[PDB]
């Protein structure tokens, strides 16, 4: 051949049990509102209800995890105390 | 000459009242001597022209500044009359410098000029005013006055620190590097809107760590130590996470090299360098591009995904193209090219069959839009006499039916020639600026709504505007208070279970935890 690849350096991202189809706290979907909301409108304004991303790389609706934090504060899908980094999908 | 002659007059009056008269009578007169005499014309003097304060500031005769400082120290309100004029001059120079008119202010040069004028002002202050408190607070307020404008300044300073950290070519030794870094963080000290600063600093970290390594390998510790004294430890969760992700990436790289030396039956697993990090830390570039990949990178990505889904039970993988690089071994000698995960698919399609066009690479590739355009242009457009992908229809704009060819270009005096069309002159186009502004706006929104739920659970309640003062004081060193935004967002806690904060019954608030 005329051009042959010798070296490659991809960077491979990884996702834990974020479940990009079912929030693990309320069980609705990674997006599509939460249980305390449901209605896409209803005094929401640009639906103030987005996805929250932990350091443990799990994902839930901000509302669900922030309401769950009131009581239990250690991420239900492992044991890690749970921190924050990215908001939204 | 007026200051010198009035000083001579003061001295001769002092010696006269010390001999011919009695020193006791000097005080009332020296009052008028600084009042009905100095104060009188001091006005005309603390302004006007004829080699005046505003002219000696731009000329730089420090002896005159020191002389007038030691002279006007006796007359009351004289320090104020000179502070107001020097502040007017500094505000003029500032609005002449922050001039946004004529978009094109060179980033590393605008902030350099800002440092140049604040340093000369501070040195004139320390040599003449002897570190006076009044002049210091006046220049502080002056700096706070014009720094509310020019919102690209944190981005300009972040681009400056990236240019200084990528390679220490200028100032090979460590002493001047240390001094320039201290001056940089001092300049950053008198800067607001730290959120965009941290965002762009993290973006520059991602740009400098996901590229060719061995930039400094030691200055990162100095940077993180300086940031612990500057930004604090609230942004080191994602900072140390970037470092830990780089560490895990190289560890998994050597581990996958070992596991490939064991298996690696396919030729796809040759010289492989696969890094591993998590979404939270490094933001998603786009919608995980899924364009056709060359058979070798396909096999490499398949092996990496199988490993990440097997050993890491629960974790998986997400293929993408908007990151990384490669070394394309071309072949009179064998010169190895370089492709940054963008030209691999097009060059592989050319290897499979040459004489393609835009339709061929847009039909049988599943190629995206903006980034495809970018790569194609970088490869056949705006190229110096090192063209690796030529075409017959020579033109600036991109057509559809244009055949692509290849040229030798023996000007490469080595075997490792790279095409670094990416990371060009800092343009900062409107779409990327708007999207990062929206991102930092959503970040600010989440930040204020995360600080309020952390604080007001252990504090008292507000009636109308009591706790907003506290939530703005806690964020004074972060960014602007944005009263309208926070007022519109706090009324969104009614839908939240924690502290509905009843608007009509604002007499008593809840504390459900
Ligand atoms: Zn949920
Ligand atoms: Zn919700
Ligand atoms: Zn977790």
Swiss-Prot record, chain A:
EC number(s) from the headed UniProt entry: 2.3.2.27, 2.3.2.32
Record gene name: RBX1
Family: Belongs to the RING-box family.
GO cellular component: Cul2-RING ubiquitin ligase complex; Cul3-RING ubiquitin ligase complex; Cul4-RING E3 ubiquitin ligase complex; Cul4A-RING E3 ubiquitin ligase complex; Cul4B-RING E3 ubiquitin ligase complex; Cul5-RING ubiquitin ligase complex; Cul7-RING ubiquitin ligase complex; cullin-RING ubiquitin ligase complex
Keyword Repeat belongs to the record: no
GO biological process: cellular response to amino acid stimulus; cellular response to chemical stress; cellular response to oxidative stress; cellular response to UV; DNA damage response; MAPK cascade; negative regulation of canonical Wnt signaling pathway; negative regulation of insulin receptor signaling pathway
Catalyzed chemical reaction(s): S-ubiquitinyl-[E2 ubiquitin-conjugating enzyme]-L-cysteine + [acceptor protein]-L-lysine = [E2 ubiquitin-conjugating enzyme]-L-cysteine + N(6)-ubiquitinyl-[acceptor protein]-L-lysine; S-[NEDD8-protein]-yl-[E2 NEDD8-conjugating enzyme]-L-cysteine + [cullin]-L-lysine = [E2 NEDD8-conjugating enzyme]-L-cysteine + N(6)-[NEDD8-protein]-yl-[cullin]-L-lysine
Residues represented out of the complete protein: 20 to 108 of 108
Free-text note on domains in this protein's UniProt record: The RING-type zinc finger domain is essential for ubiquitin ligase activity. It coordinates an additional third zinc ion.
Outcome of mutating residue 34 to A: Strong reduction in ligase activity
Tissue: Widely expressed.
Lineage summary: Eukaryota, Metazoa, Chordata, Craniata, Vertebrata
Effect of residue 72 to E: Impairs UBE2R2 activation by neddylated Cul2-RING(FEM1C) complex
Record GO terms (molecular function): cullin family protein binding; molecular adaptor activity; NEDD8 ligase activity; NEDD8 transferase activity; protein-containing complex binding; RNA polymerase II-specific DNA-binding transcription factor binding; ubiquitin protein ligase activity; ubiquitin protein ligase binding
Residues involved in Zn(2+) 3 binding: 56, 58, 75, 78
Species annotation: Homo sapiens (Human)
ZnF (RING-type) ranges: 34-79
Keyword hit for Phosphoprotein: yes
Residues annotated to bind Zn(2+) 2: 34, 37, 49, 63
Binding sites annotated in the UniProt record for Zn(2+) 1: 23, 26, 61, 64
Compartmental location: Cytoplasm; Nucleus
Disulphide-bonded residues: none
Subunit relationships: Component of multiple Cul1-RING E3 ubiquitin-protein ligase complexes commonly known as SCF (SKP1-CUL1-F-box) complexes, consisting of CUL1, SKP1, RBX1 and a variable F-box domain-containing protein. Part of a SCF(SKP2) complex consisting of CUL1, RBX1, SKP1 and SKP2. Part of a SCF(FBXO3) complex consisting of CUL1, FBXO3, RBX1 and SKP1; this complex interacts with PML via FBXO3. Component of the SCF(Cyclin F) complex consisting of CUL1, RBX1, SKP1 and CCNF. Identified in a SCF E3 ubiquitin ligase complex together with HINT1 and CDC34.
Mutagenesis or variant effect for residue 58 to A: Strong reduction in ligase activity
Keywords of the record: Acetylation, Cytoplasm, DNA damage, DNA repair, Host-virus interaction, Metal-binding, Nucleus, Phosphoprotein, Transferase, Ubl conjugation pathway, Zinc, Zinc-finger
Designated name of the protein: E3 ubiquitin-protein ligase RBX1
Curated annotation (Swiss-Prot), chain B:
Cross-link (Glycyl lysine isopeptide (Lys-Gly) (interchain with G-Cter in NEDD8)): 457
Ranges of residues in domain Cullin neddylation: 443-505
Assigned GO CC terms: centrosome; Cul3-RING ubiquitin ligase complex; cytoplasm; cytosol; extracellular exosome; glutamatergic synapse; Golgi apparatus; membrane
GO molecular function per UniProt: cyclin binding; identical protein binding; Notch binding; POZ domain binding; ubiquitin ligase complex scaffold activity; ubiquitin protein ligase activity; ubiquitin protein ligase binding
Superkingdom: Eukaryota
GO biological process: anaphase-promoting complex-dependent catabolic process; cell migration; cell projection organization; cellular response to amino acid stimulus; cellular response to oxidative stress; COPII vesicle coating; embryonic cleavage; endoplasmic reticulum to Golgi vesicle-mediated transport
UniProt similarity note: Belongs to the cullin family.
Record's protein name: Cullin-3
Gene: CUL3
Residues included from the entire protein: 232 to 768 of 768
């Amino acid at each position: 051949k005329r051009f042959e690849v010798k070296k490659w350096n991809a960077v491979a991202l990884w996702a834990w049990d974020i479940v990009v189809d079912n929030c693990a706290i309320c069980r609705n979907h990674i997006m599509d509102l939460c249980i305390e909301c449901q209605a896409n409108q209803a005094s929401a304004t640009s639906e103030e209800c987005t996805v929250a991303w932990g350091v443990c790389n799990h994902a839930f609706h901000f509302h669900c995890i922030s309401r769950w934090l009131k009581t239990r504060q250690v991420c239900p899908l492992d044991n890690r105390e749970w921190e924050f980094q990215k908001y939204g999908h | 000459v007026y200051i010198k002659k009035v000083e001579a007059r003061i001295n001769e009056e002092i010696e006269r009242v010390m001999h011919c008269l009695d020193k006791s009578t000097e005080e009332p007169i020296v009052k008028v001597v600084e009042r009905e005499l100095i104060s009188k014309h001091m006005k005309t003097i603390v302004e006007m022209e004829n080699s005046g304060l505003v002219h000696m500031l731009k000329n730089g005769k420090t002896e005159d500044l020191g002389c007038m400082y030691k002279l006007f120290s006796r007359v009351p309100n004289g320090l104020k009359t000179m502070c107001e004029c020097m502040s007017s001059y500094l505000r003029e120079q500032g609005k002449a410098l922050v001039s946004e008119e004529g978009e094109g202010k060179n980033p590393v040069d605008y902030i350099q000029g800002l440092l140049d004028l604040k340093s000369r002002f501070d040195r004139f202050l320390l040599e003449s005013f002897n570190n006076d408190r009044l002049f210091k607070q006046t220049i502080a307020g002056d700096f706070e006055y014009f720094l509310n404008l020019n919102s690209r300044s944190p981005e300009y300073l972040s681009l400056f620190i990236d240019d200084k950290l990528k390679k220490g070519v200028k100032g090979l030794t460590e002493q001047e590097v240390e001094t320039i870094l201290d001056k940089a963080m001092v300049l950053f000290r008198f800067m607001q809107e730290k959120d965009v600063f941290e965002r762009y600093y993290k973006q520059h970290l991602a740009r400098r760590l996901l590229t060719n390594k061995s930039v400094s390998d030691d200055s990162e510790k100095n940077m993180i130590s300086k940031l612990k004294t500057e930004c604090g430890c609230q942004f080191t969760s994602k900072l140390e996470g970037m470092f830990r992700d780089m560490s895990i990436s190289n560890t998994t790289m050597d581990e996958f090299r070992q596991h490939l030396q064991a298996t690696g039956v396919s030729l796809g697993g040759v010289d492989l360098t696969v890094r591993v990090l998590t979404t939270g830390y490094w933001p998603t570039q786009s919608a995980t591009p899924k364009c056709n990949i060359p058979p070798a990178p396909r096999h490499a990505f398949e092996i990496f995904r199988r490993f990440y889904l097997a050993k890491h039970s629960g974790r998986q993988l997400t293929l993408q193209h908007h990151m990384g690089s490669a070394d394309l071994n071309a072949t009179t000698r064998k010169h190895i090219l370089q492709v940054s995960t963008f030209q691999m698919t097009i060059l592989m399609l050319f290897n499979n069959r040459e004489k393609y066009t835009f339709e061929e690479i847009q039909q049988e590739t599943d190629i995206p839009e903006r980034e495809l355009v970018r790569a194609l242009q970088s490869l056949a457009c705006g190229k110096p006499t090192q063209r690796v992908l030529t075409k017959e229809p020579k033109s600036k704009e991109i057509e559809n039916g244009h055949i692509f060819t290849v040229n030798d270009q023996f000007t490469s005096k080595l075997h490792r020639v790279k095409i670094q069309t990416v990371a060009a002159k800092q343009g900062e186009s409107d779409p990327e600026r708007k999207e990062t502004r929206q991102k930092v706006d959503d970040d600010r929104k989440h930040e204020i709504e995360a600080a309020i739920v952390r604080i007001m659970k252990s504090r008292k309640k507000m009636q109308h505007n009591v706790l907003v003062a506290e939530v703005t004081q806690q964020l004074k060193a972060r960014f602007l208070p944005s009263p309208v935004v926070i007022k519109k967002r706090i009324e969104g806690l009614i839908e939240r279970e924690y502290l509905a904060r009843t608007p009509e019954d604002r007499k008593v608030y809840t504390y459900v935890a």
